[PDB]
Symmetry: D2
Subunit: 498 residues, 4 copies
């Protein structure tokens, strides 16, 4: 029997595994080491969670290797691999309320949003990639013939093997799902390291793989520290690919580690400072609604969040007035209250960074219009914040807050190339957006923006079929869409003479 | 007017540029520094070549950046970019004898081979990729609609920008062409670092880009050292991708440097220890001819060379006997002489390694059947070598010679999985081959071999349309074929709401 | 509430609808006209089925048009269309025993085969194409730019609209599923005409679309005659595409009718006379098993059945002896009995044709080795038959039997091109096969065979992912695979200047 | 030595073949039959041209069949087929002034336009498709495995064989080139029937195939009548595919003939009545320029010409005034004169139809604003024409003029869905257009338009890389782009068990 932490909450009795998941079983870490996971709504300890050690990483990688090389997963038809992944999505759907509640408790995700996005999109991801399994195809190629003989050349798409995936804490289940679905659909096996601060939905997910009948060792989950677990995964001689999502600085380190061990493949989904350009010829009330969402969605803990808004001079003051009006209407509180719009920040150290970020913004001369502070109440709540009079040289015009902080600059009426230059003057390149009713401006701006995703007259519109990844120091490689599969496949060329 | 080293040779008058090529002009390096390039047929100095410095790398990158951002290359139609690359191929064709002669002098490539392969395949590479320019396409994707509104999602394929490419010395022009053609077809601009020991066809190529009308700064060429030029390219904040071909150990360093600077993209085409499995049921005389070619082609300086031959017990002794007869018929000599079929090794340091390699082979207990030594004559000639009684634990069963050394092991009659296990017991995974008349065996073996390319009843059958790249510590990414374009493109997702 | 014909059989209760299915309801035909459907196991009447009239065709097309233009099917996300088709496959699976039993009663399909193939592959088909819905993608194309302006060109894949599909009787549910799954996945609506002699699984399928929640009018089913119902579908001005499977002569008429009405798109999956070439170097015992399967599978009522076997002279006599021995072992009888492996022919007129076919074979001088007659028991059973000494000019060498009749010719030892000529001497080109252990022969023969499918060392190996269709007078267009979708999609090119 | 009609015009000496082109030679038709080709600028006879008979069609098809089955074209590498097609494009470019002059004499094409489009796009078409030859690729497919055995399934793309193509007279060389280039790139051989009235560029093209070294019999050209030559091509037992461009009514007959003979594949590029919707929020002066182009380009002999303009009420009168001002500036004259804007109609019978068309427009009650008449000068010139107050029930609202007649209707301010319904109320669906600055309207309207091509803020923007084809009674199949290749290829599925 699996040991659970039991909790009666949100009309449910949650049953939460808290141990490492290796080779299809929940097990204590070496020396039974544990750590505390903290509820951000009140700062209380949810439970103790196993703290993976090096020997545990080695056990997990060994179980993944055996599952890949000798287990059922490497033998079944691609179509049957698809069936299992569809079934996993069904099991996740059957537990969707429980998963969303766990995400509310562990990450501070507003429950209504967690149902639809954190969990709903996770389900869509497994279903989408389940469909790809038997539709991954190689080629036959019309090469030059070695006359008087003949040649046939074909390519085969094959799995890469044992993969390690390292996940951040902002959407714990969803970020896990994005990478894991594509990885498994391609026929690989995996060791997953969730962010230390948010292990619980990953562990519940591990249990669901058992209910779905995923063969033992195909999925292994190791809560613990990046500097220990993530490091060993990146160094391991039997891991052939790392999928990493997190900060640019840690990304650099991970890629270095892959290089120095066995030149394992790596994908890097790193930070952003994404610009949103709002022209005077946009629908203004819609621009305010979408502009607010671009910043405040999931309490700003959103890698594609608009980190600068450029607003055309003639509409700037009305835009800011409408924003302040809307911001005052936002309900801050417990993620389980059904009218909550704004939940708490994910953990204490992040809240403190946001406090300092805003002090720095004021110190360097930006205008704090509203917010800027921790909300006085238990837990780790931060006020929705608006800065104006932001200039291009400022720290807050360059650095990603990863919090609910709207950072506004004017641009001159009738200018286009000049605002584009400013929007592109970052080493990041993850996302961007443009609001305008003018088809010509919309198309030109989307061409010129140096970012992996461009939203036109919307924001935060990701989709499991639409590839997602950054340019420049936001990294490389895609999650989602057909393109995600390529990170997890290798191509073998086979050439016959006959 | 360009400064040339003039040489009357092979019934031609060679005109060889010898300077750095930056922003469409031939220039001396900082401080007029130079180094000598050596003719491997007699060990003499061909000429002095400019020795690129750090300031020269920065100039080249700046010229590439300007050509990309502001020059004609970034403005013209993809179709017209194609026309220029085709014209480049035509200019190379018009200079084919001259290019093949330069490759004979600089790399010791046998002239008849250089004409057909080194140069002939380079021409095919530019023509093939010229065809791809206006056929690189993105997608429109059926995402979920934000009802009552509608959504359109498309992807755009865009160039990555300024690329650095670092090339080895075994097929100087061909290896340059593989990477450069795909890079340029994708709309990028490039800084190329040829191997220090083989700069001359690259510099002549640079002049041919002028004749073809390639805009200034699109192609820049920096002869010099890897530890200086290559390092600065991998470190440079304006370079966005490195394409690297060379040793696994240098590959590890390159990738690390990419990580620590600006997480530039990297492709790695590294070493191999490729197995060739010869079954008793093959066509024996053909297996001898193709087995010969798998080792001795281009004096063994061939990344896909068979590094181990596994021969079935019942035909082993007859195979070895027939190989020896054919080895004895090989004419060793000056690459410009028409009856030469074995030219000299590329440079002195490589010759020294081959000598040491065979010393270690004999020391550890392998049977040296013939060769193993430098040929007594001027230059850097190495006697075609055959080892038998090679056991799996031996150094020469594990390490890549990159020379004309056939390394033969036996396997028991009727065994298949046992010989596959041995063939796959390497950290490399570049190429492999199987000779057999049995359809079932050929298909099963090609499935089970852990290599990026599998040859069936042939060897060394590369084609510009067929992708080429390794698994495991042989690296990642493809040269050739449609797949090669992906390394040099980025995908932007554009999502509208309307 | 739906009216059923109820029957207790095969350890279940069959509930069979027997009326037309139009706009989501079961309804009598005009004038309450009906016809009898006949059980081929005993010659008895299963039940009366509604006989669709021209006015019923018009009602069905109108319901399909309305469902497409104004109903939910034309409004929902592609992903949600996928969900509904996956639910339909689930519902089919829940009713798999019932469906397979109906197929045994209506078509004479051996129940164990029907469960695995007739029904099992139908379920796979819906699941395969359900996965395609949100993976059907258009392109973005790098066209020449009208400088100083810019251009964006994309393609959109759109449904064709109302489709008519006309099905033969050999695999009633399976043939329906092949076409219907691809058609619906592409977002079309459909009017289906099952063969008059086999309406029952189509009508049960109709009921299952209600259980799955497929919107009204998306699927319409019209049992009746081709000369009436099929004709009107091909003539109808609101039908935009016809998918036809059947004889070559009816296909000609269908295509003509499409031309003369509104140039509706058409696919034709027509007859075949498929050659199987068996070389002396094959595995003989396996060649007998697979050779028998190529002819006798599904009592020979199989469009891809091998219609001629060419057997190398040196193994001919031993092959024929072994076939005769295995034929004697076949259990002919009631398709619901578990030991049965040869069921009755589909209907009486077909049995009569087979009797006449074999009489003609004997008259023209072929050696009847075994079979040739009706089996002396109730229903329409025909003996598994073997002819030898078949010459190229013979009627039975040219005409498709569509029954369990093995038609054997010799070819000289060592001939390859000579037998290929004879194998290709037909205006048909549906399938073909070759048995040999020789890799060079297999690859060469598969190149040279003029047929849409070539099996190598197997036969009857169809798969929902592998496209299926003929060449020459076997028609054009594919069922199955990604390729099938193109028959049911139209491409809209959209070009912007900005 | 080829017989020519020599003519000194346009500062060149034209050398025009005038005979049938069969199996690499120019030959007289049976009984030395001829007909006159007429210059539309003055009505004079240019020369006598061979008049192909049935026996001549049989000779051409035989030559094409021999070239495909036994000639060099079926033996060479795909890459070398590409080389020949690129050489063909080069030869066409070397003769571009001569070809453009012939097109001016034969078709009345304004010379400056013929250089850029009639000939310029023809050259681009051959270069584009030349690049496809070695990039046409099949697939490897992950089918279910027949355990304990394994399966490999691949597809091969193969040529269809002998094709017949039937061309109209509006862009004689360009229409020939569209179809011929894709057909030959796919590896087929061809018999071409140019429109009887415009045979000369086709015959000159034939001679250029000799200069380019295209093997004899690969291209055969038969000037003559459709009811004889075209009919026999559609009926021929050795022809496997017909590519037809022309009227809907002849298309119907063509498809019927394909049906009744050997179910040869057919593509149909038929008529159009393409709508152009102009919103009040467009750029008006640009809308006038592009609106005029949409009608008057190539004297209106343009299958995608806007056959109706719907103009928003508030801008209608100003739009009409501006069009009138600009029409008065058009220079009507000899197509060889550099100042000519508007050349003569293609032939006399077509001119007479246009006169009758405009009489009927006035009779039925539309307002004739300008033009409507034959210009008073020699040859077959027609005045650029503008109708307003066109109602939906009028003949000129339904029928394709195929001449320079702008047919304008109003729609109410704000009335998007209503104008769409009117624009879609046709059985044609070839092209369409929308002018608006509003991104929402542009995207919504392009979704809703029932046409194969939608232009947004432009018109007549075709490109060799963008597929072109209609919906509904405008036919099916694409010319141009990757999609065109599928009409000229067949897919063979090869499935191994091992
Ligand atoms: N290539 C493939 O995928 C494939 C698969 C299965 C079978 N087949 C071929 O099908 C043939 C066996 O079936 P069959 O001989 O019974 O075929 P068939 O006579 O051509 O009938 C096929 C269907 O067409 C209908 N039909 C007849 N006349 C029509 C008309 N004028 N307009 C529209 N529809 C009309 C028939 O209706 P009724 O019910 O009234 O007869 C039946 O539903 C064999 O040659 C076999 O190879 C091919």
């Amino acid at each position: 029997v699996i040991n659970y932490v039991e909790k009666a909450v949100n009309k449910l009795t949650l049953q939460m595994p808290y141990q490492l998941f290796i080779g299809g079983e929940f097990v204590d870490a070496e020396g039974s080491k544990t750590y505390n996971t903290i509820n951000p709504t009140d700062g209380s300890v949810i439970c103790q969670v196993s703290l993976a050690q090096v020997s545990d990483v080695d056990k997990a990688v060994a179980a993944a290797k055996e599952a890949f090389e000798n287990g059922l997963w490497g033998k079944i038809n691609a179509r049957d691999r698809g069936r299992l992944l569809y079934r996993l999505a069904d099991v996740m759907e059957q537990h969707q309320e429980e998963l969303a509640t766990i995400e509310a408790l562990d990450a501070g995700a507003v429950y209504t949003l967690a149902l639809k996005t954190h969990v709903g999109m996770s389900i869509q991801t497994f279903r989408y990639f389940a469909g790809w399994c038997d539709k991954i195809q190689g080629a036959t190629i019309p090469i030059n013939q070695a006359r008087p003989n003949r040649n046939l050349t074909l390519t085969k798409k094959e799995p890469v093997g044992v993969c390690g995936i390292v996940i951040p804490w902002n959407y714990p289940l969803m970020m896990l799902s994005w990478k894991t679905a594509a990885c498994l659909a391609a026929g690989n096996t995996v060791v997953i390291k969730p962010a230390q601060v948010t292990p619980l939905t990953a562990l519940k997910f591990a249990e669901l793989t058992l209910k779905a009948g995923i063969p033992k060792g195909v999925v292994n989950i190791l809560p613990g520290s990046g500097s220990l677990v993530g490091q060993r995964l990146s160094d391991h001689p039997d891991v052939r690919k790392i999928g990493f999502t997190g900060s640019t600085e840690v990304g650099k380190h991970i890629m270095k580690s892959c290089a120095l061990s066995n030149v394992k493949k790596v994908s890097l989904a790193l930070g952003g400072k994404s610009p949103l350009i709002i022209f005077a010829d946009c629908d203004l009330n819609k621009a305010v609604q979408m502009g607010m969402s671009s910043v405040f969605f999931n309490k700003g803990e959103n890698c594609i969040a608009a980190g600068r808004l450029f607003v055309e001079e003639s509409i700037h003051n009305q835009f800011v007035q409408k924003v302040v009006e809307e911001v005052e209407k936002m309900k801050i509180g417990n993620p389980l209250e059904r009218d909550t719009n704004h939940g708490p920040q994910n953990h204490e150290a992040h809240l403190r960074k946001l406090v300092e970020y805003c002090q720095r913004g004021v110190k360097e001369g930006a205008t704090l219009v509203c917010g800027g502070n921790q909300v006085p109440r238990p837990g780790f709540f931060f006020q929705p914040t608006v800065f104006t009079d932001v200039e291009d040289h400022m720290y807050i015009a360059k650095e990603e807050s990863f919090g609910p902080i709207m950072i506004i600059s004017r641009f001159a009426d009738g200018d286009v190339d000049a605002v584009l230059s400013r929007a592109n003057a970052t080493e990041f390149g993850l996302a961007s957006g443009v609001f305008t009713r003018d088809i010509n401006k919309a198309l030109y701006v989307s061409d010129k923006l140096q970012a992996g995703t461009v939203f036109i007259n919307t924001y935060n519109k990701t989709d499991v079929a639409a590839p997602f990844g950054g340019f420049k120091q936001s990294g490389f490689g895609k999650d989602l869409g057909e393109a995600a599969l390529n990170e997890y496949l290798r191509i073998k060329t086979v050439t016959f003479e006959y």
